[PDB]
Write an enzyme that holds these catalytic residues in place. Structure first.
Site, PDB file in Angstrom:
ATOM      1  N   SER A 159     -66.872 -59.021 -79.008  1.00  0.00           N
ATOM      2  CA  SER A 159     -66.245 -58.423 -80.175  1.00  0.00           C
ATOM      3  C   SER A 159     -65.244 -59.322 -80.884  1.00  0.00           C
ATOM      4  O   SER A 159     -64.877 -59.006 -82.020  1.00  0.00           O
ATOM      5  CB  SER A 159     -65.559 -57.127 -79.771  1.00  0.00           C
ATOM      6  OG  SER A 159     -66.540 -56.178 -79.483  1.00  0.00           O
TER       7      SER A 159
HETATM    8  C1  LIG Z   1     -67.064 -56.032 -78.255  1.00  0.00           C
HETATM    9  O1  LIG Z   1     -66.686 -56.833 -77.399  1.00  0.00           O
HETATM   10  C2  LIG Z   1     -67.606 -54.655 -77.886  1.00  0.00           C
HETATM   11  N1  LIG Z   1     -68.081 -54.573 -76.512  1.00  0.00           N
HETATM   12  C3  LIG Z   1     -69.329 -54.198 -76.175  1.00  0.00           C
HETATM   13  O2  LIG Z   1     -70.126 -53.729 -76.974  1.00  0.00           O
HETATM   14  C4  LIG Z   1     -69.754 -54.389 -74.732  1.00  0.00           C
HETATM   15  N2  LIG Z   1     -71.189 -54.224 -74.578  1.00  0.00           N
HETATM   16  C5  LIG Z   1     -69.076 -53.434 -73.831  1.00  0.00           C
HETATM   17  C6  LIG Z   1     -69.300 -52.062 -73.916  1.00  0.00           C
HETATM   18  C7  LIG Z   1     -68.635 -51.197 -73.046  1.00  0.00           C
HETATM   19  C8  LIG Z   1     -67.761 -51.704 -72.086  1.00  0.00           C
HETATM   20  O3  LIG Z   1     -67.110 -50.875 -71.228  1.00  0.00           O
HETATM   21  C9  LIG Z   1     -67.542 -53.073 -72.001  1.00  0.00           C
HETATM   22  C10 LIG Z   1     -68.206 -53.927 -72.878  1.00  0.00           C
HETATM   23  C11 LIG Z   1     -66.445 -53.701 -78.128  1.00  0.00           C
HETATM   24  N3  LIG Z   1     -65.235 -54.449 -77.882  1.00  0.00           N
HETATM   25  C12 LIG Z   1     -64.582 -54.205 -76.623  1.00  0.00           C
HETATM   26  C13 LIG Z   1     -63.144 -54.608 -76.673  1.00  0.00           C
HETATM   27  O4  LIG Z   1     -62.532 -54.776 -75.596  1.00  0.00           O
HETATM   28  O5  LIG Z   1     -62.616 -54.770 -77.796  1.00  0.00           O
HETATM   29  C14 LIG Z   1     -64.799 -52.726 -76.295  1.00  0.00           C
HETATM   30  C15 LIG Z   1     -63.732 -51.834 -76.932  1.00  0.00           C
HETATM   31  C16 LIG Z   1     -64.797 -52.522 -74.771  1.00  0.00           C
HETATM   32  S1  LIG Z   1     -66.385 -52.344 -76.995  1.00  0.00           S
END
Ligand SMILES: *C(=O)[C@@H](NC(=O)[C@H](N)c1ccc(O)cc1)[C@@H]1N[C@@H](C(=O)O)C(C)(C)S1
Ligand SMILES: [Co+2]
Ligand SMILES: [Co+2]
Ligand SMILES: [Co+2]
Ligand SMILES: [Co+2]
Length: 448
Positions: A159
């Protein structure tokens, strides 16, 4: 009969010595390389070989500059020039120590961090955990980090890549920070299914909230407005897939699939930071562009060289690259303040409240990227690269900080979770204190 060149020294931006030679004896006279800081920046500086020539790091990659050329008799001895780095030893020392104890506290495989000067992109600190000590035999340090992962070892950003989508959607006039969106909990895109990290129905997230709460769905909806070509174009402008030319050995270029080879699902992945890889330096360099009012300046670690007589030649500055307008950059900086905004009622809280420093307009972005499971060709479910990148400060950018934690069990400060935000907090807060930098209304992430 041979007249030996005296090896040049390596110093930081204020001429504090990192490596220098003293004359000693044993093949009777013997030149001793000194590292008064031990492991301090040894990932960058490197180490020496038995013959007094560079073994690895800058000692090796700039050996010709540092070693000079031996004279004879009649040819005069060209002594080694001194290399002046952009590093600030005080900042390097603090960051390097904090990187080590974030690795200890978080249980991550490794930790690295980069601090760039916001205006010039100069490398003020670059550190990893477990840094070897070049004053000691390297064959005795197989358990040490001998290299420089911040430039050599790319990862999927997750992200923190969402800065690209945010920059494109504002730069092309496709949204604004206050636009109220409608964001479902999941969408089908490019033949695949994308979920947000929390279950929810349609939420009235603002554009600001989409990036503050890190809605993948919201990011992809906004990215549909940009389209692949403008989005890929902006990836390139932010410098991904390309070496920076920082002047360090072993720099990776990372990996960005060119648009002519995308599959149906590629666009559903790149804007949330999966399907591509970058180094920590590239990652930090992206945020430097937004900090420098939209002009990306490729980072550099060599500030100057000093010839043996004492004449100083500055390193040539790299050419500016305009990524987005100054207005767009200022808007993205303000909007990313929401990532560190705290809300006790939850509604207007970003993903990284611990990264805020009260009294300052800190702005940044969290990341959680799933790592590839090497045995299935598929993503791990619970193995992550944790990232944070931020700017101190949004109203007056001075420092860009990038951090990656390789699969921590805890926060960087040791509390439950998987966040690099507390490490950003410590470093950015300390940078403001030490320069005695002086100290509006809450941002709306979620409408009604
Ligand atoms: C970006 O990094 C996003 N993460 C994900 O989509 C990732 N697959 C993910 C999903 C759910 C989790 O528990 C862990 C990882 C979004 N950005 C992250 C951040 O920390 O900013 C999230 C809010 C966890 S999702
Ligand atoms: Co001759
Ligand atoms: Co669901
Ligand atoms: Co957990
Ligand atoms: Co604090």
């Amino acid at each position: 009969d041979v007249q030996p060149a005296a090896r040049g020294s390596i110093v930081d931006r204020n001429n504090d010595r990192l490596a220098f030679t003293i004359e000693a004896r044993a093949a009777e006279r013997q030149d001793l390389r000194q590292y008064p800081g031990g492991s301090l920046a040894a990932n960058v500086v490197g180490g020496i070989d038995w013959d007094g020539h560079g073994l690895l790091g800058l000692e090796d990659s700039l050996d010709a500059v540092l070693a000079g050329t031996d004279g004879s008799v009649r040819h005069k001895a060209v002594h080694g020039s001194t290399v002046v780095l952009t590093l600030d030893n005080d900042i390097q020392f603090y960051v390097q120590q904090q990187v080590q104890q974030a690795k200890n506290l978080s249980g991550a495989h490794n930790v690295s961090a980069v601090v760039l000067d916001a205006k010039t992109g100069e490398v003020l600190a670059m550190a990893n955990d477990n840094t070897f000590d070049p004053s000691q035999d390297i064959g005795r340090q197989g358990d040490k980090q001998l290299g420089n992962p911040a430039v050599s070892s790319p990862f999927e950003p997750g992200s923190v890549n969402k800065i690209v989508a945010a920059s494109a959607v504002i730069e092309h006039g496709l949204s604004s920070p206050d636009e109220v969106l409608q964001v479902p909990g999941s969408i089908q895109m490019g033949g695949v299914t994308v979920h947000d990290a929390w279950e929810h129905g349609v939420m009235p997230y603002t554009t600001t909230g989409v990036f503050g709460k890190s809605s993948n769905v919201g990011t992809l909806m906004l990215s549909q407005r940009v389209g692949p070509e403008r989005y890929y174009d902006m990836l390139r402008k932010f410098g991904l897939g390309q070496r920076t030319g920082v002047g360090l050995p072993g720099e990776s270029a990372g990996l960005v699939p060119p648009i002519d080879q995308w599959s149906g699902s590629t666009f559903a992945n790149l804007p949330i930071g999966q399907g591509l890889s970058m180094t920590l330096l590239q990652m930090t360099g992206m945020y430097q562009a937004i900090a420098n009012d939209g002009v990306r300046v490729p980072p550099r670690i060599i500030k100057a060289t000093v010839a043996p007589d004492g004449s100083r030649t500055e390193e040539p500055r790299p050419d500016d690259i305009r990524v987005v307008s100054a207005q767009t950059a200022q808007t993205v900086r303000q909007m990313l303040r929401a990532v560190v905004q705290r809300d006790p009622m939850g509604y207007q809280q970003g993903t990284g409240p611990t990264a805020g420093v009260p009294g300052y307009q800190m702005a940044g972005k969290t990341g959680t990227a799933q790592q590839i499971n090497p045995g299935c060709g598929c993503y791990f479910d619970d193995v992550y690269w944790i990232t944070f990148a931020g700017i101190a400060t949004a109203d007056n950018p001075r420092y860009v900080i990038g951090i990656m934690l390789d699969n921590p069990a805890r926060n960087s400060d040791g509390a439950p979770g998987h966040s690099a935000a507390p490490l950003f907090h410590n470093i950015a807060g300390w940078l403001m204190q030490r320069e005695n930098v002086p100290l509006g209304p809450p941002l709306v992430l979620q409408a009604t």
